Design a protein around this ligand. Structure first.
Ligand SMILES: [Zn+2]
Ligand SMILES: [Zn+2]
Lengths: 244, 256
C-alpha cells in the first residue's frame, strides 16, 4: 500500500488508495517509510505532493477499518513531520529520529512526539427523549449527539459538562462511561459517555451547532450510521427511554 | 484574562517555568501581587478558585522552584488549576516559534492555543492519555513497588495509551506487559489530569482472570496481592491511584 500524503491530503487516483507497486505510481527513487501492515502486506508513507488527485482522509472512510486507520495514521505522521520542520522552543530546523516517530532539534535538546488529542462524546437523555443536534460546520442533515475536545486541567467529566454548557447551555448529571475509540486523520482518542438532563434550556451556539432538540424514542430523526460510537450511544439511550 | 498586573490585583499566583513553579515555603502563593513582586508582569487568568482568580506568570524565580507534586495536599480543584498553569507555561515555551514556518507565534485570547503571525496554522496543548487500573482478586488488591523510585509506596499499574489503541486495549496490554496477568470485568471509574508532564489519567477497576505474576526487574521491584483491610504504604489522597485503591477496598467491605 502506497500512502502519498501532503498538507492533510493523500493521493487517491480515481478515489482509490494506491496499491500495487512504485513503478506504476512514480515512486521510483523516492523516499518512503513503512508505517504498518494490512492483509500481510506492507503499508508505506511517502511525503510528496501530486499535481492532481490529492484528497482528504474522509474520502477513504468507506474502506476497511484497519486500512483506514493506517492511511490516516500516515497522513497524521506526514503532517506531524510538517508541523515540526522548525523547533518551537528555539526556531532552528529539526530532523526526524531514525529510531522512533519523533522530531529532534538540530540546535537544542528539546523534541516533539505525535499528539493524541483526547476528546469526549456524550448522549444526553431527558425522560423519554434524547438531545440530538446538527452541526454548522458539517450540515449533512444528520442529527447526532454532542462532542468536543478535552482542555488542559480538566477531567473527562468536566470536559463533558463544559462542552454541553458551551454548545447547548444544559446542565447534566449521572455521567456514565460506555467505551472509547482512536481516530487517525487528526489523531485523537474519543471517550463515550451517557448523561441525564439536570436543568437548563437549549441555547445553541450557532458557530458550532445549526440546531438542537429533544427527540422521543418513538420519533427519531436521521441518525449516524450503525457501527459508529455516536449511533451506539443513541441506541443505548433510546433503548433505556423505551424501557422506561 | 490576559493583561499586565496592576496594584490592586489579588488571588492565586502560579509562577511557573521549565515544569516547576514558585512555592515559597512549599506553599502555593495566595494574596496581593504587591506582596509577591508581581506588579507589572504579564499574567493569564487560567481559572478561579472559590471566587478568587488563579493567574499564570511565566517567570523563573532564583529560589523555591519545585514540582507541583508538593502541593498535592491542596483541594483537588485547586490542584487541577495549579497543574493547568504549569502545563500551559510549558506549552507556550514549546510554541515560541511556529513549527510549520519558523515565524514567532502569539497566544490566542479566546482559547488555549498558539496562533502563527505568518501561517494559517495553530497548536493546542499536548495531553497524553494514560490508563491506571486497580486489579482485585477476591479479598485482595494487586499493589506494585516501582524500581525507578524506592519511596516504599505500593501502587496500582499505569501506562501511556499507544497510537490506534482504545482505553480497554491499553489496559490489557499494559497489565500483560507489566505483570503477565489477564483481567476481566474492566470498569471505568474516573479521570484525572496528571501534569507529570502532561498526562490525562483514565481510571479503571478490574478483576483477576488468569495468568502468573511476571514483572520486569528493571521496572518493578515487586508486585503482590494485599488484603483490602491490611494494605502497605499507599500513594497520598489527591491521586486517582489512591481513589481506585479506596474504592476497591469499599467494594470488598460491602461484599465481605
Ligand atoms: Zn530547538
Ligand atoms: Zn507559521
Amino acid at each position: 500500500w502506497w500512502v502519498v500524503s501532503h498538507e492533510q491530503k493523500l493521493w487517491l487516483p480515481k478515489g482509490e488508495l494506491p496499491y500495487g507497486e512504485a513503478a506504476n505510481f512514480d515512486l521510483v527513487g523516492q523516499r518512503a517509510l513503512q508505517i504498518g501492515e494490512w492483509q500481510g502486506e506492507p503499508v508505506w508513507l511517502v511525503q510528496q505532493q501530486r499535481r492532481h488527485d490529492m484528497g482528504s482522509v474522509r474520502q477513504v472512510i468507506d474502506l476497511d477499518v484497519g486500512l483506514f486507520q493506517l492511511a490516516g495514521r500516515g497522513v497524521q505522521l506526514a503532517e506531524f513531520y510538517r508541523s515540526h520542520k522548525y523547533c518551537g522552543y528555539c526556531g532552528h530546523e529539526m530532523y526526524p529520529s531514525k529510531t522512533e516517530w519523533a522530531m529532534l532539534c538540530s540546535h537544542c535538546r528539546e523534541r516533539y512526539y505525535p499528539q493524541i488529542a483526547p476528546c469526549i462524546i456524550v448522549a444526553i437523555r431527558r425522560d423519554d427523549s434524547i438531545l440530538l443536534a446538527q452541526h454548522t460546520r458539517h450540515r449533512n442533515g444528520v442529527h447526532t449527539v454532542l462532542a468536543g475536545f478535552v482542555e488542559v486541567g480538566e477531567t473527562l467529566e468536566q470536559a463533558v459538562a463544559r462542552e454541553v454548557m458551551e454548545q447547548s447551555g444544559i446542565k447534566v448529571k449521572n455521567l456514565r462511561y460506555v467505551t472509547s475509540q482512536p481516530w487517525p486523520f487528526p489523531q485523537s482518542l474519543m471517550t463515550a459517555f451517557m448523561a441525564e438532563y439536570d436543568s437548563g434550556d437549549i441555547v445553541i451556539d450557532p458557530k458550532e451547532l445549526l440546531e438542537a432538540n429533544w427527540y422521543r424514542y418513538d420519533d427519531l430523526p436521521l441518525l449516524p450510521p450503525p457501527g459508529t460510537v455516536a449511533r451506539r450511544l443513541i441506541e443505548d439511550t433510546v433503548a433505556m427511554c423505551r424501557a422506561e
